[PDB]
Symmetry: C2
Subunit: 580 residues, 2 copies
């Protein structure tokens, strides 16, 4: 960097002479290289002091400049408001000159604060990794925990005033200089490529485009082929219900990409709350292209099952082949496409599915909540297993076309156990226990629906009472989950509405109409979710159950797409969440 | 910019008070605002002096730093070569430290020279546009030509040592620091986004991907549909020969995009020789996406002509509809998609087709040469006109499926007239007149072939002599055009081959195998081009003429794709070209 750096890292000399010593390589050599590590760590203290001092006085200069520019901004505002009253006596042009110079000064100040934030971040990363390397050399007694003690606090890193400074600078600038709108500041502060390493790389965007185009055209051909070629067999429900899982996954991945885009460009931090590595960013482009590729695979699988199989290949292979490809991509353990992200996702799966065992964090809870909505995927996988193990024709190849309650409750089971672990760790009341109650309502409703349906099939004369009980339990479950989604999980309908009518005290997204539409759709769609789960689980209604389930599931995934939006914004703004 | 600038432009104050004066607005007011313009232009002289002085001493400092770093590079090379002889007595690590510091110094020097080149370029653009604005105010007697006198030379801009400095810096750095390979310097000098304004913008790359994917899948569906549905009519030649023009245009546009990419990333300047605006760059992404969109249109047109028309729409509309869409896109005069580039292309078409009239430049000659190969497009348009005017069924809608020599010679006619205009302007010999002779060989061969074919149809007994004459004329035409393409139009086979065996003295592209493959394919493909033109023009051979013509035309466009590559590199390296 062409910045005022002396070394700021030591680059790689530490490692160069570490190699020079260790490669050369008991009696007194033990203590000799122990002393060498001791001077290594005294140089580490020297680096700590250097970064501490440099961050300290640069940050102090930043505060001084902030105060000076606040005074200048107040002076400019005073002279333009009630003090002066194309030419307009040239006073308006003088004020325009003041506006331009204020904007330039604020832009260079923004660049400087971004630069110092980058400086401290790159230091953090650098010397953390060098201490990691020293630990790998041989498991030093110091480092590791001692490194944490002297690094995680790191008086240069201790002061979290960088984030508050940048946030308040943006807020106060948009207050009057850019009338509270992101567009103008974005125009004059166009996110310089530094800080975020080439966001949306060229090739990733090209692949996003290619896969999205292939998906669009494949979908068009699929609609056309289904419309003009379906006839033949009169039982397409097995195929539609077997590919509903893939379709729901594709839709959820597209909408999660949209969620990441909205979080990134709406000013709501999401990497910090997700505890991801600051540099390992999964920008929306990566998620969009992964979802597009899986969509290409799904569409090709359905096309193959439709028109013609390679003219002598069991057509039941295509669902199995597609799902095997998906699971192999997710589980493949080598060092190929997106190995880091897949490994992180697998570790999260291990931490969440085997509950309570481990801690809770936030990613585990978020994924458990997402499964609470995607349970239709588990249902479809159970149906796949059952069909391909009992109702299949292993030799015949003329065409593919009481535990369901347990599998449907599995997501609610893991979420309930997660919340019980939360309660054990914290030993607290509501809102810790109310979540457990709400998620147990799902168990109660599903099991009572199953009992009522099996009694109806049996033909008992008391099914009216059980139906009434199911109605009341469904009502209370939907009401409690809606009240939870509005009050304790979104922050809306607070007692401090203030200016924001019927909304939270503070907001991040631009238009309130978005919030109103989201609330109305959520209230009208929680009933839909409950109805869908009950109906597709045990209501037993034939000839229409599959169609209703498959028209409601994608819309439920859309519900979760909105709910991610309006939770993770409440996690960063109000940030109750019990996490950190 | 956070650079050492005082104003470097005057930003917009010149225009601010120009508006303040002119809006306020004979007797003595005439001379009053004449004096105002006089002080405007004295301030322009002040700006000229400022930029001249600043460029002068910054450039002198650049030369001083260049000399100092040359001395340091020589010292490092001396100490690493024959002077010193993981550890290797630590001398190799000292030399590695020298390498790292030399690389860092050269990287910052490269950044500085790029910065000063940007400074002078942005000045040029800025004050050129402000003088343009002053001219628009009211057609000042000064400015315009006086502005050219005091701007185009511009002692800050007069010294073209910037280009030679950057080029020799790259060359000398790759000489030993990066062993003559672009990859290493590219790795450590990754084309900072400054200078080229966000090359390949995100949305343009996304559209490139989308259109390329739609094109790939449409092509797959087209192959499948043609293979499994062609039957029906036994006369597909009208359709194939009517869409051959569109296919050739799509292929040529894709290959021209590849040409622009190769020029851009192979270190061969192409904007300067094309006299395009320095900022209005048509990166390869734009050309690729335009070609992809036209390909989507063509593929959809063929699909519509294939399967089913919207079930009651004359199927002959689809070729007409596609070509009307293309011509409307090219000719539409509003301020919509790529208006600047389309207007430039239309002006070039006017300057080239109406020859000699205007001057020659280089873009006109290049486009005339490209038409000399794409003449099949003119032939296909002539066939379209003839068919749709004489052999069509205006009412019947059951299915669409001696001037040809003149239209085939039209490109050679315009090129010949262009070269005659060149000769008139310059009053010179070979290589100015040899081009005219070579392009007249095409007239001679085509007309003699036509006469021989019409005599053969007539049944004259002297067709043997005419066939022999056509053979000899074809031989001499192919030989002369090949000798021209190798000697005077590529620079290859020079008498100063030196190290480069059988090649030019200096080369730009990395691998010589590329040059050898290109020469061999050109020698074996010029015969193919001549055969194709003669056969598709008048050889009269039925039942095979269309197929041979349509297998050879795309390959001829490929020939021109290679020839652009290896001419515009000879235009920048040897730069004979008679132009500038």
């Amino acid at each position: 960097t062409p910045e005022w750096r002396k070394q700021y890292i030591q680059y790689e000399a530490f490692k160069d002479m570490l190699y020079s010593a260790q490669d050369q390589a008991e009696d007194t050599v033990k203590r000799y290289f122990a002393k060498f590590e001791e001077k290594f760590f005294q140089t580490c203290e020297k680096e700590l002091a250097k970064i501490n001092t440099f961050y300290s006085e640069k940050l102090a200069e930043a505060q001084r400049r902030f105060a000076t520019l606040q005074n200048e901004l107040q002076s400019s505002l005073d002279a333009q408001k009630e003090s002066t009253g194309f030419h307009l006596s040239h006073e308006e042009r003088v004020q325009h000159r003041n506006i331009k110079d204020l904007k330039l000064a604020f832009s260079e100040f923004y660049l400087s604060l971004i630069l110092l934030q980058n400086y401290q971040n790159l230091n953090f990363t650098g010397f953390r990794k060098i201490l990691k390397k020293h630990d790998k050399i041989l498991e030093t007694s110091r480092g590791a925990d001692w490194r944490v003690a002297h690094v995680e606090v790191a008086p240069f890193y201790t002061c979290k005033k960088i984030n508050q400074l940048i946030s308040e600078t943006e807020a106060v600038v948009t207050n009057e200089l850019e009338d509270g709108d992101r567009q103008k500041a974005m125009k004059r502060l166009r996110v310089p490529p530094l800080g975020a390493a080439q966001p949306a790389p060229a090739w990733t965007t090209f692949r996003v485009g290619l896969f999205c185009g292939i998906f669009i055209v494949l979908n068009i051909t699929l609609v056309l082929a289904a419309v003009f070629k379906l006839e033949t067999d009169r039982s397409i429900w097995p195929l539609i219900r077997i590919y509903r899982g893939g379709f729901l996954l594709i839709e959820f991945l597209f909408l999660l990409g949209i969620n990441t885009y909205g979080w990134r460009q709406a000013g709501v931090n999401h990497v910090l709350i997700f505890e991801l590595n600051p540099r390992s960013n999964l920008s929306h482009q990566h998620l969009f292209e992964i979802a597009g590729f899986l969509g290409i695979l799904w569409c090709l699988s359905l096309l193959a099952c439709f028109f013609a199989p390679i003219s002598v290949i069991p057509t039941y292979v295509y669902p199995l082949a597609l799902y095997g490809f998906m699971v192999f991509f997710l589980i493949n353990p080598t060092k190929t496409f997106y190995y880091k992200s897949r490994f992180w996702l697998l570790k999260l799966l291990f931490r969440v599915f085997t509950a309570p065992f481990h801690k809770v964090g936030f990613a585990d809870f978020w994924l458990a909540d997402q499964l609470n909505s995607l349970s239709v995927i588990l249902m479809d996988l159970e149906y796949m297993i059952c069909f391909y193990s009992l109702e299949l024709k292993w030799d015949e190849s003329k065409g593919l076309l009481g535990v369901r309650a347990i599998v449907q409750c599995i997501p609610a089971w893991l979420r309930f156990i997660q919340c019980l672990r939360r309660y054990r760790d914290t030993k607290r009341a509501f809102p810790h226990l109310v979540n457990a109650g709400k998620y147990s309502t799902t168990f109660f409703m599903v099991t009572f629906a199953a009992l009522y349906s099996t009694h109806k099939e049996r033909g008992h004369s008391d099914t009216m009472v059980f139906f009434y009980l199911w109605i009341v339990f469904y009502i209370i479950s939907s009401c409690y989950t809606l009240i939870w989604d509005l009050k304790m999980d979104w922050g809306l309908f607070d007692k401090n509405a203030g200016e924001n009518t019927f909304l939270r005290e503070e907001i991040v997204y631009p238009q309130k109409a978005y919030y109103y539409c989201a609330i109305i759709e959520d209230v009208i769609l929680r009933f839909a979710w409950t109805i869908q789960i009950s109906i597709t689980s045990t209501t037993l209604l034939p000839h229409s159950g599959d169609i209703i389930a498959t028209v409601f599931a994608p819309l439920e995934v859309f519900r979760r797409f909105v709910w991610n939006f309006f939770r993770l914004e409440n996690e960063h703004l109000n940030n109750c969440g019990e996490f950190r």
